[model samples]
Target: ADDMERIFKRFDTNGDGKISLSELTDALRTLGSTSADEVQRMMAEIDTDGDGFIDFNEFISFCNANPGLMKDVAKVF
Candidate 1:
């Protein structure tokens, strides 16, 4: 949890308790072009209310929703 929070804090540039699309893009860009669609799909999937931005709660929910993926990501980082 500490590692996740530390990494996410770096991505949450606006300090608004949420991550905007641009921030997401910036983070995903580090992974290379193959991640573009994957990132978009993740953004859409996590944006449950369809507000287009991911709040901290929504992000947590998203991680919970995909425990396996979250674990994989945690390992990668």
Candidate 2:
């Protein structure tokens, strides 16, 4: 998740050093993201909170899921 963490921080423009749905919205804009419902579903996989926003640990969980995709996903940025 080294790269993913770096990327998330890069996208974290809010200065609090944590990612929000608004920031993640721009980060994954190309993932066919077109709805709050879809994005909300994305974080439910991590189950940290009910709001479905991306937190640090939540993102770590995400990176774990995509470990095999680093070479492929890193190209996105």
Candidate 3:
């Protein structure tokens, strides 16, 4: 999953070891051109712990659940 780690690092622009809402929003906007509401919805779904941010484990779980997710996002990047 080194590629996954690399993609996560890129998305986590602040390098805080987590993906915040704005970081996610910017990633989505820059990579995929998603809508604002769609970004919010995506964050809500991936942040399974309800802490308003996505850590590596949560991101991994989310991607596992949606097996094609990384492919789609990485393709845009």
Q: Can you write out model 3's per-residue Cα lDDT over 1-77, one digit (the tens) per residue?
A: 34356577876776577776556655655666445455456766755556767778876655542444454566565
C-alpha lDDT of residue 61 in model 3 = 58
Q: How close is candidate 1 to the true structure, as a TM-score?
A: 0.51
Backbone clashes for every candidate come to: 0, 0, 0
For candidate 1, lDDT tens digit of each residue in 1-76?
5524644675677767677654564564454323445556666675546666666776665544243444444435
Error of 3 at 60 (Å): 1.4
lDDT of each: 0.55, 0.54, 0.60
Deviation (Å) of 75 in candidate 3: 3.1
Kindly indicate the candidate among 2 and 3 with the higher lDDT: 3
Residue 31 of candidate 1: its Cα lDDT?
Answer: 42
The candidate, 1 or 2, that scores higher on lDDT is: 1
Clashing pairs in 1: none
How much is the lDDT of residue 77 in candidate 2? 48
User: What is the C-alpha lDDT profile of model 2 across 1-77, one tens digit per residue?
Assistant: 45565567666666765676545644554643334344445665554475645657766665553434433444454
- TM-score (all chains, Cα) for each model: 0.51, 0.54, 0.55
Q: Judged by TM-score relative to the true structure, which candidate is superior, 1 or 2?
A: 2
**For model 3, how many clashes?**
0
Tell me the deviation in Å of residue 58 in model 3: 0.8
